[PDB]
């Protein structure tokens, strides 16, 4: 593996010729040109010119030295440049530089070559030539090439072109490789030259020639590549950068879009709730109030706790969009005006306001509600039941001197005005039932029952009713042989009767009546009956009723069939014969049933083997 | 149809007898006997004691006449006795009797026997006699016997024997008749002596004998059947009117035994029922009271109307049996003590006064009750709405001097103040719970919501926690290159994503949150992330949550991520190669997508080809 002192020879030729190459690559950006690092250098101008390029500092060496001291002093102060970065530089003086000699000025130019070039690929226990070479051997893992030098890996010229492909493939084709030297070569070195931008640093007829290529030349144009790679690198990282941050701007703002379409939203919905509530106007009805204050409770239900969820969400919403940006260093986010996360604060608290005021209305409305109907029922119960009482006690009240006609006249008067009582108590129910309905079951406005005022009412009359026949029946006692305590009895059957106080006996309720008395036989089914229709028609004399008059004139006529006491002992004495006994045989003659025997055994007292009936005969 | 000379003579010594045969059976009864009216009557005794007894009247006629002045005046008194009643004595004088002339004597004896055994057949138009036959003729209408004259009809003495048959049926039987003129006869005067009374006045050999009996004779024998039989039916008539009076009586005790129980029955069951009243005792709790109020509605509609309809009912059942007494001449009924209808009416009226003082206890109860339920959630809840807004005030003031850290302590002790209002609340709820269900929509005490307290405790505990963070994100501002204003948007969102208020982020709950942020892959289902739980346990280091510290360190570093102004100002520089502007295809060659690009055209301003992102950097 030892070179050949003919091949050494040609290396350092073809090692001056892209040394020369790599220079003016970078003096040209300064239409700067050399022609030969080997004695271009000696002057030190060039070197220092290419040093500022490179190395981005302003060094002020002599334009055109023509002393020798110049040279060298110009080679202090360009060398300690280079000295200052992290290079070795033990062996070279200036001198060595002024005088021309070749393997130590190859020498120089190699060590800003890795410097300058390829530096970033040193890692502490890695040079970079080594780094530089896992660089390439990196890049072509899918390709059919063999990496092991930069001599003899490269000769084939087919790992230069794998590099390309692997970083832009766009730029040279990659199916026409993999066999012409010259060719792939050359494909290789113009690629490079017209969009890489890069010179053809190496000779392309110098390499298919020599058995072996020159390390460090091939290393120096390997070196342009990577660093225009570390451009393409460095671009794309900073496109990368710049796209997380334009991608989080964009983002942030689909949420201002969506915070201030909510914002408003609220704002509007808000506005609305509280103009339907601040227009309500509170009704006069119960079941109106009660359903009135049922849709402020389907708010505190419903759409209220919507709002303020809605109005939280949007103050962190709010407040999640400006953590973003003050992280970001931007400029903080501020809501348009009255859309800011306060402003929503202070319209929740406005419809709280306006809802407060607007239950608060509506509970007064109620207990005025309540409160009617209480009173709409007390007051005129109340007043009716003062009414009827004042009118009870004085029925009940008997201390009149007036005469008996004129009480009876009065009496009738008193009892018309009450009468017009009956037609308010209708309405006095319902105002109790409408409480019912309303479930109001506490009143503190009055104690009296609706039962109360209609048994009241309906005795009270009956009272008055019955005073009338009492004092009339006194009246009229010597005309009629009736005594006024029949009259009360008579009265108080006909009225008991009487199912619809019309004063008047129907043809069927006279028939209750009489199948009462047993003066009838039953008929349960109400059939026709002749001789109850005779008795009917008799009475009432086709007169459409028994009136009360009639009535009394038919049980008159039933009492006077029953015989007189005197008339009673007649009719005793004859079933005896004449003695003060009855006794059983005597009555068996007469026909006398066993139960009619044994009423008078068992009522009457024993007086020897017959019953004394002077005791019934009292006379 | 003449008479025969014998004839009549055997007429007149038959109608002798058998008028003498008359005479001494009503003489018997005074134990006086004659032998012949032809010669008997000449002295007037025997015929003023026969006018005596037949005439009920005291007659005084001489015992002894021995002139004929007493006998003849004895008949002028004993005749003007005859001529009182109606029948016509032209004819007569007493001289006629004294000196014993048969027809005349006869036709007197006869004038007696008309008007004092058959009178009563006589009807204006109809003579004795002719009523007297159709009384014959009718009482045999089933009798195969014919009844056209007193002579030749009875001289078979068929008739005889159908005349006691028709009214006494019992003591001759009838199947042994029809045939022997003897036996008929024999047995219907031996039938009217030993059962009937009446002796056997005519003679069974003077009948047989003779082609047609005395008229006369026979009709007086009739006479005497006739005078038995109407006693028969008299006696028969005072048992019927004393049978329908008895009944009247049992039935009317049947009355006063109904009553009497019955009257007993409601003062028991009115006892009964107050007692129920005046015992029971009103509750604290509403939907007792409700209950206790229904159950007098259920009296009102029940068993106080009843009673109201058995005591009226019984008040006419009482004046009805003394109704028929009074009719009756009976004494007049009286019931035992305290049962009477008055008595009665004092019930009803000691019952409605149990009752009204029910009711009206119970609805104070219920007033006192309601109150109390609108008190057991108004005062409390007034005294928890004014103990968190006086802290809610507090936390609002920022007047203090006292240093940061004095500030902070102060306020997280007052925080723990407020906070343990949280437990107070629950009870709180449930007193406006328990008025709904006593179904109370008005409250006086009290306009709060229940609503508005956990409203403004959650609302004012977080303001509190709220500016803790902030005053000690102040105060450590040096410590921590954290904004005080970014902690704020810290806390709002942790607190945002802790669903309970723990303080602490749960595994799950920090997933929701970077979800939200986009920093991981959605998974809605919940599954398994082996990045999350990486992230996770990194974030909390295994702390079972994320703790607040431990959540801004997060959020730090995402923050400290991004770029600087003076940063982002070389990211762009990079971009464009080193120029104020920004060209698209500068941004195309580092990769940018379009929508990047097209974010960059319409925010950024334009500056030739390029956007100028100084606007950006504004630093
Ligand atoms: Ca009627
Ligand atoms: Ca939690
Ligand atoms: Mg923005
Ligand atoms: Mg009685």
Redesign the pocket.
């Given at each position: 593996a030892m070179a050949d002192s003919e091949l050494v020879a040609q290396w350092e030729k073809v090692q001056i010729k892209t040394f020369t190459k790599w220079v003016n690559m970078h003096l040209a950006k300064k239409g700067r040109k050399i022609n030969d690092v080997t004695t271009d250098f000696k002057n030190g101008v060039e070197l220092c010119a290419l040093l500022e390029i490179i190395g981005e500092t302003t060094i002020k060496c002599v334009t055109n030295p023509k002393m020798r001291i110049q040279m060298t002093e110009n080679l202090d102060k360009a060398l300690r440049f280079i000295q200052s970065r992290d290079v070795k530089l033990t062996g070279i003086g200036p001198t060595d530089i002024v005088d021309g000699n070749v393997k130590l000025t190859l020498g120089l130019v190699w060590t800003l070559i890795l410097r300058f070039a390829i530096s970033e690929l040193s890692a502490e226990g890695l040079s970079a030539k080594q780094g530089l070479l896992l660089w390439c051997q990196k890049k072509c893992e899918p390709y059919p090439v063999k990496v092991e030098n930069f001599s003899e890996s490269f000769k084939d010229g087919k790992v230069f072109c794998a590099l390309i492909h692997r970083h832009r493939p766009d730029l040279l084709d990659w199916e026409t490789v993999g066999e012409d030297d010259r060719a792939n070569l050359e494909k290789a070195f113009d690629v490079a030259e017209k969009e890489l931008g890069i010179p053809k640093l190496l000779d392309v007829d110098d390499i298919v020639n020599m058995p072996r290529p020159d390390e460090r030349s091939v290393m120096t144009y390997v070196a342009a590549l990577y660093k225009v790679f570390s451009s393409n690198d460095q671009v794309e990282k900073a496109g990368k950068r710049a796209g997380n941050f334009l991608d989080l701007l964009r983002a942030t703002e689909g949420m201002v879009h969506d915070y201030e379409q909510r914002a408003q939203a609220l704002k509007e919905n808000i506005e609305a709730a509280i103009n339907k509530m601040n227009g309500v106007e509170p009704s006069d009805e119960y079941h109106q109030v009660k359903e009135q204050i049922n849709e402020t409770k389907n708010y505190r239900k419903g759409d209220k706790r919507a709002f303020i969820k809605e109005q939280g969400d949007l103050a962190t919403l709010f407040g999640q969009i400006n953590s973003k940006l003050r992280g970001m260093k931007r400029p903080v986010y501020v809501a348009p005006e009255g859309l800011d996360p306060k402003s929503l604060e202070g319209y929740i608290a406005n419809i709280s306001e306006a809802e407060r005021a607007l239950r608060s209305k509506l509970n007064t409305a109620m207990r005025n509600c309540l409160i009617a109907l209480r009173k709409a029922f007390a007051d005129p119960a109340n007043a009716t039941d003062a009414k009827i009482n004042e009118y009870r006690t004085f029925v009940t009240d008997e201390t009149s001197e007036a005469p008996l006609e004129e009480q009876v006249a009065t009496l009738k008067a008193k009892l018309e005005e009450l009468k017009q009582v009956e037609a308010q108590l209708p309405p006095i129910e319902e105002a109790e039932k409408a409480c019912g309905d309303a479930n109001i079951e506490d009143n503190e406005y009055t104690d009296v029952s609706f039962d109360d005022l209609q048994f009241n009412y309906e005795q009270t009359v009956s009272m008055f009713e019955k005073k009338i026949v009492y004092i009339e029946a006194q009246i009229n006692e010597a005309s009629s042989g009736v005594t006024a305590e029949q009259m009360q009895e008579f009265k108080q059957s006909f009225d008991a009767f009487?199912?619809?106080h019309?004063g008047?006996?129907?043809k069927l309720?006279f028939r209750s009546c009489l199948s009462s008395m047993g003066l009838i036989d039953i008929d349960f089914t109400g059939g026709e009956d002749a001789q109850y229709d005779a008795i009917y028609n008799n009475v009432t004399k086709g007169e459409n009723g028994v009136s009360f008059d009639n009535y009394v004139q038919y049980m008159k006529e039933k009492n006077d069939e029953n015989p007189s006491p005197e008339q009673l002992n007649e009719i005793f004495s004859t079933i005896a014969a004449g003695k003060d006994s009855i006794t059983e045989t005597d009555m068996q003659k007469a026909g006398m049933s066993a139960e009619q025997i044994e009423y008078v055994k068992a009522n009457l007292p024993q007086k020897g083997d017959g019953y004394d009936y002077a005791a019934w005969v009292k006379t």
């Open positions: 009487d199912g619809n019309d008047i006996l129907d309720e």
